[PDB]
Amino acid sequence: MLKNLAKLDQTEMDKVNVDLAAAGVAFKERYNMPVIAEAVEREQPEHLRSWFRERLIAHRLASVNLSRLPYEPKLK
């Protein structure tokens, strides 16, 4: 109703944060700069290891697409 703590929930955002790390691993194409597949993997809590894996496919799509919607202008 008001308290809304259940929304921000450290676990809720934990889940969202893990994907970002996964995306970072997709920066392995950009391995012309430093990317540690070990680190990202180990940064993700083994508990939800599957989540990293599943998200990895998602981030693979997002890596190969290139698009991703960067900055660009585009304003009404």
From Swiss-Prot:
Organism superkingdom: Bacteria
Catalytic activity: DNA(n) + a 2'-deoxyribonucleoside 5'-triphosphate = DNA(n+1) + diphosphate
SUPFAM superfamilies named among the record's database cross-references: DNA polymerase III theta subunit-like (SSF46575)
GO cellular component, one term: DNA polymerase III complex
EC number: 2.7.7.7
InterPro entries: DNA_pol_III_theta_bac, PolIII_theta_sf
GO biological process, any: lagging strand elongation
GO terms of molecular function: DNA binding; DNA-directed DNA polymerase activity
UniProt keywords, alphabetically: DNA replication, DNA-directed DNA polymerase, Nucleotidyltransferase, Transferase
Purpose: DNA polymerase III is a complex, multichain enzyme responsible for most of the replicative synthesis in bacteria. This DNA polymerase also exhibits 3' to 5' exonuclease activity. The exact function of the theta subunit is unknown.
Subunit composition and interactions: The DNA polymerase holoenzyme is a complex that contains 10 different types of subunits. These subunits are organized into 3 functionally essential subassemblies: the pol III core, the beta sliding clamp processivity factor and the clamp-loading complex. The pol III core (subunits alpha,epsilon and theta) contains the polymerase and the 3'-5' exonuclease proofreading activities. The polymerase is tethered to the template via the sliding clamp processivity factor.
Protein name as it appears in the record: DNA polymerase III subunit theta
Annotated source species: Escherichia coli (strain K12)
